[PDB]
Scaffold this active site. Sequence first.
Site, PDB file in Angstrom:
ATOM      1  N   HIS A  40       0.819  -1.217   0.000  1.00  9.23           N
ATOM      2  CA  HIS A  40       0.000   0.000   0.000  1.00  9.23           C
ATOM      3  C   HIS A  40       0.856   1.272   0.000  1.00  9.23           C
ATOM      4  O   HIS A  40       0.332   2.379  -0.082  1.00  9.23           O
ATOM      5  CB  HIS A  40      -1.022   0.002   1.164  1.00  9.23           C
ATOM      6  CG  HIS A  40      -0.447   0.348   2.507  1.00  9.23           C
ATOM      7  ND1 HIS A  40      -0.263  -0.589   3.491  1.00  9.23           N
ATOM      8  CD2 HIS A  40      -0.046   1.533   3.025  1.00  9.23           C
ATOM      9  CE1 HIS A  40       0.232  -0.001   4.572  1.00  9.23           C
ATOM     10  NE2 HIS A  40       0.372   1.284   4.314  1.00  9.23           N
ATOM     11  N   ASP A  84       0.025  -7.674   2.050  1.00  9.19           N
ATOM     12  CA  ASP A  84       0.532  -6.302   1.980  1.00  9.19           C
ATOM     13  C   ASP A  84       2.058  -6.313   2.058  1.00  9.19           C
ATOM     14  O   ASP A  84       2.651  -6.024   3.107  1.00  9.19           O
ATOM     15  CB  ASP A  84      -0.054  -5.467   3.124  1.00  9.19           C
ATOM     16  CG  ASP A  84       0.093  -3.973   2.897  1.00  9.19           C
ATOM     17  OD1 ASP A  84       0.553  -3.563   1.810  1.00  9.19           O
ATOM     18  OD2 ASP A  84      -0.254  -3.201   3.813  1.00  9.19           O
ATOM     19  N   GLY A 175       2.781   6.843   8.726  1.00 10.17           N
ATOM     20  CA  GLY A 175       4.146   7.237   8.424  1.00 10.17           C
ATOM     21  C   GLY A 175       5.088   6.095   8.768  1.00 10.17           C
ATOM     22  O   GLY A 175       6.261   6.083   8.374  1.00 10.17           O
ATOM     23  N   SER A 177       4.090   2.824   8.161  1.00  6.06           N
ATOM     24  CA  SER A 177       3.803   1.786   7.171  1.00  6.06           C
ATOM     25  C   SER A 177       5.023   1.326   6.386  1.00  6.06           C
ATOM     26  O   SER A 177       5.844   2.145   5.970  1.00  6.06           O
ATOM     27  CB  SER A 177       2.751   2.276   6.173  1.00  6.06           C
ATOM     28  OG  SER A 177       1.462   1.958   6.630  1.00  6.06           O
ATOM     29  N   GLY A 178       5.112   0.011   6.175  1.00  3.73           N
ATOM     30  CA  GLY A 178       6.211  -0.567   5.424  1.00  3.73           C
ATOM     31  C   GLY A 178       7.438  -0.849   6.263  1.00  3.73           C
ATOM     32  O   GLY A 178       8.328  -1.600   5.847  1.00  3.73           O
TER      33      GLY A 178
END
Lengths: 223, 41
Positions: A40, A84, A175, A177-178
Amino acid sequence: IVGGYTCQENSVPYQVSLNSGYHFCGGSLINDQWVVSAAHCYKSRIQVRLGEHNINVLEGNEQFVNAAKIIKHPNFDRKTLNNDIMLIKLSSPVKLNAHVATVALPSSCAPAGTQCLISGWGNTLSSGVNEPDLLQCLDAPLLPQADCEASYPGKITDNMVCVGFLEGGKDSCQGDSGGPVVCNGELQGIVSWGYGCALPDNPGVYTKVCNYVDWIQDTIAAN
Amino acid sequence: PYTGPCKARIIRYFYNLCQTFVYGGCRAKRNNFKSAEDCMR
Ligand SMILES: [Ca+2]
């Protein structure tokens, strides 16, 4: 990261920032030419920043490398966020050193109760907005899948794992995410989603990396 | 404005007048534009 602490200077060398003009997501360096993040966090153009501590100041240890190939999992679902995960191939290999290092892929799936380290430059407030300059860290355990499912009824798939506290207070946020969830030197999770940040009965949900080691290795060898 | 469950930090526009807010990266609502102009239209 809400409820965390500032990470010690270059104690999280595998952490990267994804930038397209501003920081928008985190990621992890798995080898000198590949970054793993969340699907995402996809963007057609991404610059990867390594060796960062204060994302708003040029410190001298950072490496700026543009993404050459961005590959999302073929089964990623933008609605449910199942699978994801995404791989990024860098334009050129990076220079590995004390500030820039790789993190190992999982040997197996870590059991519930395992203590992990989560990091990122995301919002530090559950209510309001405070974007840190410095990288934040949070020590939190992998939650039992039953508690994960109880927190998010019918929304948890076998490719997701909950990390954090059922009482809230500490959690990853927008912020983050990932970004990495590392347990015993192995990357076991990727910050994905959750309802709000640090709210009771709603701990963070992360992509279960151990279910993708073969896909990761197969993709890297083919590209 | 609806940030959503995802934790990305993407700046988007929403109507008050057309202002900015952080969008999480997934499950956006209608009051979520990529530009002010499209937002004001
Ligand atoms: Ca910096």
